[PDB]
């Protein structure tokens, strides 16, 4: 429902949605290939379905293709930092399509 | 220490990683097990 919403907000006004009391199929997320980038460091995607945490905050916004390349760890540039920041430290899958 | 006899860059040493899920003690394992770990495509040149 979140992804198929007609209008997303602008990149500066990043909607913060709290996620709780719902079942998330991370494994289906990984196996599904419509999602263009499912980069992962923290936890193995097969075990992801098994592993469960208490609090999840999800961020939604829209950017250019070049800025999708630019919003990557260990990289320096204009959009990556200036208006909506992703900290180096967080444990959280980055999903782009 | 190995700085005297090695560390020239020295890349000779190879350590095996995801090929085996687990492994019994005190066996030497040389099996190539071409591309295994976990996936839907198999047995080729895979990314």
């Amino acid at each position: 429902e979140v992804f198929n919403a007609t209008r997303f907000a602008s990149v500066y006004a990043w909607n913060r949605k709290r996620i709780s009391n719902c079942v998330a199929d991370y494994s289906v997320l990984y196996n599904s290939a419509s999602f263009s980038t499912f980069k992962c460091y923290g936890v193995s995607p097969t075990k992801l379905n098994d592993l469960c945490f208490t609090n999840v905050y999800a961020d939604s916004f829209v950017i250019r293709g070049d800025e999708v390349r630019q919003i990557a760890p260990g990289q320096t540039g204009k959009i990556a930092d200036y208006n909506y920041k992703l900290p180096d430290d967080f444990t959280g899958c980055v999903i782009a399509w | 220490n190995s700085n005297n006899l090695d560390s020239k860059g020295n890349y000779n040493y190879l350590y095996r990683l995801f090929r085996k899920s687990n492994l019994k003690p005190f066996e030497r394992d040389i099996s190539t097990e071409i591309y295994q770990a976990g996936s839907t495509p198999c047995n080729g040149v895979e990314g």
Partner: antibody
């Protein structure tokens, strides 16, 4: 620095065997995942094989599987190809390939190519 | 897999901001595609690797982008020496596969 010498052009009767060299001079050979390629006149280039020099094991491309044997001679720092059951359509210029595929290091595809056969 | 490029040949005079796209039929990974540049009567030369992972040793004017089913190689500032033939290359699973080629003319 790195180069693979091309031979004098060859013509073979169908069904014969052709040996194509691939010289490596300079750099640290036997570390890179050596591969193989060719390009037909007026057609794009096509991949044939991959040879891991350390364990001397190779795999063959589907379209050419069962016809190409690839080995790497570490002593002479060379890469060898053996092609059998040659036919009329198989004639084309053949190239050699290298570039490093390491493990979780990325950069699977890279140049380090030569000039031809 | 078929690597659909834009277009087979683009007849453009020098300096355009040229998106030399490549569209694989099935998703090939967003760090998993590569472009090669063949000089006239020569052997191709790698310019961009891993879809967006800028190849070392290369000036910024050539830059690959895209993800999913549509991928793009961008030329930001076309120069006289940039006219050449460019080939994309599947980098995910399966054998290395090359596009039918894009020849860049003046």
């Amino acid at each position: 620095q790195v180069q693979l010498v091309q031979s004098g052009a060859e013509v073979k009767k169908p069904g014969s065997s052709v040996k194509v060299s691939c010289k490596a001079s300079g750099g640290t050979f036997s570390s890179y995942a050596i591969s193989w390629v060719r390009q037909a006149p007026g057609q794009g280039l096509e991949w044939m094989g991959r040879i891991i020099s350390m364990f001397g094991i190779a795999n063959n491309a589907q379209k050419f599987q069962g016809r190409l044997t690839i080995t790497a001679d570490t002593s002479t720092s060379t890469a060898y190809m053996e092609l059998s059951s040659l036919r009329s359509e198989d004639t084309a210029v053949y190239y050699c390939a290298r570039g490093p595929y390491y493990y979780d290091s990325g950069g699977y595809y890279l140049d380090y190519w030569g000039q031809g056969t | 897999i078929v690597l659909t490029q834009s277009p087979g040949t683009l007849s453009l005079s020098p300096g355009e901001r040229a998106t030399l796209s490549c569209r694989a039929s099935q998703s090939v990974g967003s760090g998993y595609l590569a472009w090669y540049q063949q000089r006239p009567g020569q052997a191709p030369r790698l310019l961009i690797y891993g879809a967006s992972s800028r190849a070392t040793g290369i000036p910024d004017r050539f830059s690959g982008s895209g993800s999913g089913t549509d991928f793009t190689l961008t030329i930001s500032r076309l120069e006289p020496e940039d006219f050449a033939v460019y080939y994309c290359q599947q980098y995910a699973g399966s054998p290395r596969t090359f596009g039918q080629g894009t020849r860049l003319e003046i």
